[PDB]
Amino acid sequence: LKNPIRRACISIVEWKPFEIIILLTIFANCVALAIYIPFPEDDSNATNSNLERVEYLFLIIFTVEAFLKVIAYGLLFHPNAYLRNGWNLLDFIIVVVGLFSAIKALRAFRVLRPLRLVSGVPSLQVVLNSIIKAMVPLLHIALLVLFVIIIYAIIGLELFMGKMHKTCYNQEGIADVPAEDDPSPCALETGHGRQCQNGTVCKPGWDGPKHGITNFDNFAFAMLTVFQCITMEGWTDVLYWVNDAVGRDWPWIYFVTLIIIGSFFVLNLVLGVLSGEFSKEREKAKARGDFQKLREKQQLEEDLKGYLDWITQAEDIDWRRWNRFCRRKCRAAVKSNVFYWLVIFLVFLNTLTIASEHYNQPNWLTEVQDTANKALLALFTAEMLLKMYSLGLQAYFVSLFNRFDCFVVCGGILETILVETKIMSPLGISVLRCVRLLRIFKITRYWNSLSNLVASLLNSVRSIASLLLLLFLFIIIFSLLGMQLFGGKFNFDEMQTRRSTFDNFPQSLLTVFQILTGEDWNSVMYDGIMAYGGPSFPGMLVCIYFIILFICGNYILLNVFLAIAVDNLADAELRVLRVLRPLRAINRAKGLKHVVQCVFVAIRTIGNIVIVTTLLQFMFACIGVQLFKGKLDNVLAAMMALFTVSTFEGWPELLYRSIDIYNYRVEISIFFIIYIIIIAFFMMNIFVGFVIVTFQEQGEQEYKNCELDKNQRQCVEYALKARPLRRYIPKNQHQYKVWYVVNSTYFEYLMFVLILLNTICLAMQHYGQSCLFKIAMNILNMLFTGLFTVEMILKLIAFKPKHYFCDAWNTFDALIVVGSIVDIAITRISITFFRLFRVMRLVKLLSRGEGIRTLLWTFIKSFQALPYVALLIVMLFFIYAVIGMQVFGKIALNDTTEINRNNNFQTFPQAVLLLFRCATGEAWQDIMLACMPGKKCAPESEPSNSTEGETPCGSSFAVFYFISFYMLCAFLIINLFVAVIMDNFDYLTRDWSILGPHHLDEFKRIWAEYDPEAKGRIKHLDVVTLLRRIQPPLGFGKLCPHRVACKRLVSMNMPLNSDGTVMFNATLFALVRTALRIKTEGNLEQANEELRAIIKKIWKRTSMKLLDQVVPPAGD
Ligand SMILES: COCC(CCO[C@H]1CC[C@@]2(C)C(=CC[C@H]3[C@@H]4C[C@@H]5O[C@]6(CC[C@@H](C)CO6)[C@@H](C)[C@@H]5[C@@]4(C)CC[C@@H]32)C1)COC
């Protein structure tokens, strides 16, 4: 605290150019660290030598800036988070520089420098703050995944402990396989791993993972494997591996349960993000009403144009006289609808003429195609001057739509004039055809169903710019960190050209992008860990770097998808055909027939959008193939055919294959971006249309309130049905005191730590097995069983066995006890559920998350509209499963040809498995490509001698059928998501911020619990002793028994039925009165209307009139 001169004279240096120069310095540092040519070890080629010295200048300017800030602010620089981050970065940099100068791991902290750029730039701090704040309330949800990612993993340790040790090394350290087949053990019960290679040896070894990484031993490896499986990428590979290793049909249930739990968790996270976004899309947005401001702006524009037309009419209604007379006729003629129809027909005909190019290269007609184009200019000019003559000079020119048309036509005529002469790289025909596409924008003026969409697309870019910049900066920092960590260490002791590397900046950036997309990232991570950190205790430090790079990346992309949701918010602002019974049976809900009707009535608009996108593709393909891709399918079908393998699963495969003409017009790939991006918007816009359709399907079911209020009506109808309970407690006081004290936070914590160390005994079981650790875990298991028996004995007798089988959680722990006593009576595969019971005790931790279990109570109990969609999806599976049997019979299972014993189809359960695998999108393109007309299918039948060279297996129709199946399944799961989010809208997106009605319900449950006496008639001298604390949020304040004693004892009359008898229902009604607004005695109008309209229109209580016997003491 010192401000005579220096503090006053140093806080003045806060110029805008000062921050500009600081940002320029940061950008220069980022560029300097960008190249930093990596070397194996200390190669001073005069480049890194100078980059070493530049760091001195950067450090000194940063530290003088920090000193200025510290002097200016004193003990206020530190509390700010970003200032503290910058100070810590600077301290680390100066410390490492000093340590190096005194005499290289800390150099990676320099990579953290670009983050400081976001510390000062506006319009980015707010975005990052909103992003980090949105995910906080959902953090608890993420914790659940941890439990899951442990639980099932433990199951594997029980069932797949060292099941990959046995191999099929042919002679000595070499398996009898082409380095691809899993050397499954020569099991005593044959059927899997037969290893019939005419001379085989089955010996223990490591022939599982490509590097011995994802083996189920070494529990951390099991966790890595289950995490890799839970991301929906390559789980079929490990499923086939384990099925070949141990046997068929036994373990698939585990993976199916894992995948369905993962899907449910994804749904839950999406609903949580929905609630987080809705908490701000309406609140604080309807307040300022910026949408109303935009509506006012467009209304003002419309009114201005109308009044200007009025003024033009007024001036026109009265040398020059002939010109004025012709002005009226010119202004009247252009407004005729016949003229507009003729003009639009001419424009469409000309656009068809310029689009008549069918990729041919003739000469007799191409010349005819030339001159007419020039005439089109006249056809695109006559209106123009008329709009400059019929309408005002400054009126028509200023509309933000027709001005674009003027620019387009002027550019087109100038380009035509230019291409009339010679020009290198003309592109004139391309841009002329592109502006002919813009003629359809006039067609877009009519039928505004696309004009509104394109206006929303134009609007959304300004908001999405910040998010895309943040994502680009994020991938930049992560690419820099990846380049620093490896720096060309991808030797692998091999020669084959790896598809990715971290030696140069662009290749590292594209590798990071590919990892973020999740395509083949597992193999890249395996290679990265095997480069230096071989499987061991310190070798896993690399692996975590990948994991974060996915989640913190993907979530952001999902947040970008949430931004897309915000953009959406911006867009919202003949054999066995006897199965007809379900069609008649499912006609009861009637909640989806309207959905089908809306979909099949909007399919026309969907097809029109598909057609216009196909026309755009035709234009782009014509331009590209006429200008490039010169041969040393079709201009409107080749892109579609590529898209059949480029559905966002295969375009990364295209990049993967093309990373090896070569660079001749690679922009098509980026075109394959933009088009897909256009789809990724317009289809999303169609989905946004579907959103509106869902808003019409389910969002229009709000009907009329027909009650006193909107939320207080819900409170009244919720607090009038609440009834008091008793909660009987037995006579045993000592044992129940032991329950209250011992069986409490202490007991649950000790149970959690003991089961955790039990897992450390079983989850962390020794790799392979050792006799010492074996007997250690045996005796520890005996001790655990003993302590479990002791705890259940003290929880059984002390709980008054009469009351033992009453509570629901008591029955749950009773089931746990019965599992334990099964354990002690059997202490064995397929019966070792008791150990799972121990991991089932981990599920008990979820109970301790009562605050989150309500979420579960709203999901698993949400099975009200779920049965209808579930029946629809299972009948879809039935109809699409039984139909494939006869058409794909004799599937021709063969080893290592993508159709094998694991890929078998003739068996019904395996066919279901295959169709489920295709449903999730796990490389179903290969499945589609595995059924060709020329492929032989089980040449065992008598007329299969290939006499005519014909394979009796067409199967060239499953592509369209499976595409339709994928679309239907995606639409149905979207429908179920909409159903569940609508079911939980009055639960999650409610007023849960501070004073949500569910908080009132929880406090009602507290009232049912907070009064242990349960005497029914609680005295006024007794409620002050215990019921003094009523409710913090709803109550007036912490001035018990009543903060407003006068109001709460006069308006709510002091209850004195029997020595101050208070009724639970009467007290709840009093709390409602505190929430509602009715005055003291003499409120006959509002109070009597509320209490007598109960019979008719407020809360139907014609029966159970007991309220009209307890309220007259208080209210009636
Ligand atoms: C009482 O509250 C309702 C009321 C009336 C208006 O209803 C709105 C409620 C949210 C709702 C249904 C609306 C628009 C965008 C909808 C989202 C589009 C995204 O599409 C998905 C589907 C899966 C992905 C393919 C893309 O993301 C979802 C995550 C997202 C979505 C289905 C979540 C729910 C959203 C309309 C006032 O609310 C403003």
Curated annotation (Swiss-Prot):
Stated role: Pore-forming, alpha-1C subunit of the voltage-gated calcium channel that gives rise to L-type calcium currents. Mediates influx of calcium ions into the cytoplasm, and thereby triggers calcium release from the sarcoplasm. Plays an important role in excitation-contraction coupling in the heart. Required for normal heart development and normal regulation of heart rhythm. Required for normal contraction of smooth muscle cells in blood vessels and in the intestine. Essential for normal blood pressure regulation via its role in the contraction of arterial smooth muscle cells.
Chain segments carrying region AID/alpha-interaction domain: 298-315
Ranges spanned by the short sequence motif Selectivity filter of repeat I, renumbered to the chain: 231-234
Site residues by UniProt (Calcium ion selectivity and permeability): 233, 649, 922
Expression tissues: Detected throughout the brain, including hippocampus, cerebellum and amygdala, throughout the heart and vascular system, including ductus arteriosus, in urinary bladder, and in retina and sclera in the eye. Expressed in brain, heart, jejunum, ovary, pancreatic beta-cells and vascular smooth muscle. Overall expression is reduced in atherosclerotic vascular smooth muscle.
Activity control note: Inhibited by dihydropyridines (DHP), such as isradipine. Inhibited by nifedipine. Channel activity is regulated by Ca(2+) and calmodulin. Binding of STAC1, STAC2 or STAC3 to a region that overlaps with the calmodulin binding site inhibits channel inactivation by Ca(2+) and calmodulin. Binding of calmodulin or CABP1 at the same regulatory sites results in opposite effects on the channel function. Shear stress and pressure increases calcium channel activity.
Extracellular side: 36-50, 161-220, 243-250, 357-367, 420-428, 487-506, 529-538, 768-775, 889-910, 930-957
I repeat coordinates: 3-278
Family statement: Belongs to the calcium channel alpha-1 subunit (TC 1.A.1.11) family. CACNA1C subfamily.
Glycosylated residue positions: 45, 198, 894, 945
Gene, per the UniProt record: CACNA1C
Effect of residue 251 to S: In LQT8; uncertain significance; no effect on channel activity
Phenotypic consequence of residue 665 to H: Found in a patient with autism; uncertain significance
Compartment(s): Cell membrane; Cell membrane, Sarcolemma; Perikaryon; Postsynaptic density membrane
Subunit record text: Component of a calcium channel complex consisting of a pore-forming alpha subunit (CACNA1C) and ancillary beta, gamma and delta subunits. The channel complex contains alpha, beta, gamma and delta subunits in a 1:1:1:1 ratio, i.e. it contains only one of each type of subunit. CACNA1C channel activity is modulated by ancillary subunits, such as CACNB1, CACNB2, CACNB3, CACNA2D1 and CACNA2D4. Interacts with the gamma subunits CACNG4, CACNG6, CACNG7 and CACNG8. Interacts with CACNB1. Interacts with CACNB2. Identified in a complex with CACNA2D4 and CACNB3. Interacts with CACNB3.
Intramembrane region ranges (chain numbering): 221-242, 507-528, 636-656, 911-929
Effect annotated for changing residue 331 to H: In TS; likely pathogenic; only with cardiac manifestation; decreased current density; associated with slower inactivation
GO biological process, one term: positive regulation of muscle contraction
Intervals, Cytoplasmic compartment: 72-80, 122-138, 389-399, 448-466, 590-608, 688-745, 850-867
UniProt PTM: Elevated levels of blood glucose lead to increased phosphorylation by PKA.
Residues annotated as binding Ca(2+): 233, 519, 649
Catalysed reaction, written as an equation: Ca(2+)(in) = Ca(2+)(out)
Parent sequence residues shown: 109 to 1658 of 2221
Transmembrane helix keyword on record: yes
Membrane topology per record: Multi-pass membrane protein
Domain comment as written in the entry: Each of the four internal repeats contains five hydrophobic transmembrane segments (S1, S2, S3, S5, S6) and one positively charged transmembrane segment (S4). S4 segments probably represent the voltage-sensor and are characterized by a series of positively charged amino acids at every third position. Binding of intracellular calcium through the EF-hand motif inhibits the opening of the channel.
Protein's UniProt name: Voltage-dependent L-type calcium channel subunit alpha-1C
